[PDB]
Design an enzyme around this catalytic site. Structure first.
Site, short mmCIF file in Angstrom:
data_model
loop_
_atom_site.label_atom_id
_atom_site.label_comp_id
_atom_site.label_asym_id
_atom_site.label_seq_id
_atom_site.Cartn_x
_atom_site.Cartn_y
_atom_site.Cartn_z
N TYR A 116 64.07 54.77 49.91
CA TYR A 116 64.57 56.03 49.54
C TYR A 116 63.98 56.48 48.30
CZ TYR A 116 67.26 56.24 53.73
OH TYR A 116 67.60 56.08 54.93
N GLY B 132 61.58 57.72 45.75
CA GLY B 132 60.23 58.47 46.20
C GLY B 132 59.84 58.81 47.52
N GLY C 114 61.89 58.47 50.66
CA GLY C 114 63.10 58.98 51.66
C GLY C 114 62.99 58.51 53.04
N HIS D 179 70.89 60.71 46.41
CA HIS D 179 70.15 61.69 45.69
C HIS D 179 69.22 62.49 46.76
CE1 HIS D 179 66.69 63.20 43.05
NE2 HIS D 179 67.64 63.54 42.39
N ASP D 180 68.87 61.95 47.58
CA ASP D 180 68.13 62.73 48.56
C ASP D 180 68.96 63.66 49.25
OD1 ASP D 180 65.49 61.47 48.11
OD2 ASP D 180 65.41 60.09 49.80
N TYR E 103 69.70 66.53 47.18
CA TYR E 103 68.71 67.71 47.22
C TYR E 103 68.99 68.40 48.77
CZ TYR E 103 66.17 66.31 43.12
OH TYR E 103 65.88 66.13 41.82
N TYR F 73 64.94 73.26 35.31
CA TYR F 73 66.35 73.46 34.56
C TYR F 73 66.31 73.09 33.07
CZ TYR F 73 67.15 68.76 36.19
OH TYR F 73 67.09 67.12 36.13
N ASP G 275 70.40 65.39 39.64
CA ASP G 275 69.74 64.21 39.08
C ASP G 275 70.39 63.68 37.97
OD1 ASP G 275 67.62 65.61 40.60
OD2 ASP G 275 66.56 66.46 38.88
C1 LIG Z 1 52.06 62.93 37.83
C2 LIG Z 1 51.86 62.45 39.20
C3 LIG Z 1 50.59 62.77 39.94
N1 LIG Z 1 53.01 62.76 39.92
C4 LIG Z 1 52.80 63.43 41.02
C5 LIG Z 1 54.43 63.55 41.83
O1 LIG Z 1 54.47 64.32 42.88
C6 LIG Z 1 55.03 62.20 42.01
O2 LIG Z 1 56.05 62.66 42.74
C7 LIG Z 1 57.43 62.68 43.11
C8 LIG Z 1 57.81 63.05 44.59
C9 LIG Z 1 59.08 63.22 44.81
C10 LIG Z 1 60.14 62.71 44.11
C11 LIG Z 1 61.47 62.78 44.52
C12 LIG Z 1 62.80 62.45 43.77
N2 LIG Z 1 62.59 61.24 43.38
O3 LIG Z 1 63.65 62.68 44.32
C13 LIG Z 1 59.98 62.31 42.69
C14 LIG Z 1 58.37 62.28 42.38
#
Ligand SMILES: CC(C)NC[C@@H](O)COc1ccc(CC(N)=O)cc1
Length: 121
Positions: free
Chosen positions: A27, A29, A31, A47-48, A51, A64, A89
């Protein structure tokens, strides 16, 4: 937004949002599907789900403001979506901090096929 979340994670855990939490378990990153691998993976699942309770808000991009009252994370008054994202978060951060002691590197870059299973929020 993600700038807020990552900054929150680092402060809390000391590890960096990317890549410590951007590709962990099933999950963090990414999900989607599966049975959360461990406590840190459960924070991501929850956490997912967090959201997911906010249908018309934009977690990733809506910024925020939050402050620290001696270590406590205090979400500041903003739009009501901003208030609720922030809470979602703050929890993940607290949850992350709570299971640092079991954060395990073998779940880093976890392969997808290994993530199949059922879990309703
Ligand atoms: C700086 C870099 C390229 N970041 C790009 C960024 O899209 C990283 O992405 C994500 C995507 C999704 C999430 C969801 C969260 N953790 O709940 C966290 C981080």
């Amino acid at each position: 937004s993600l700038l807020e979340f990552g900054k929150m994670i680092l402060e809390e855990t000391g590890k960096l949002a990317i890549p410590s939490y951007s590709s962990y378990g099933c999950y963090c990153g990414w999900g989607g599907k599966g049975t959360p691998k461990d406590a840190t993976d459960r924070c991501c699942f929850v956490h997912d789900c967090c959201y997911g309770n906010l249908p018309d808000c934009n977690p990733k991009s809506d910024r925020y403001k939050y402050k620290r009252v001696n270590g406590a994370i205090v979400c500041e008054k903003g739009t009501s979506c901003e208030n609720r994202i922030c809470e979602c978060d703050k929890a993940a951060a607290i949850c992350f901090r709570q299971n640092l002691n079991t954060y395990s590197k073998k779940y880093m870059l976890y392969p997808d096929f290994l993530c199949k299973g059922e879990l309703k929020c």
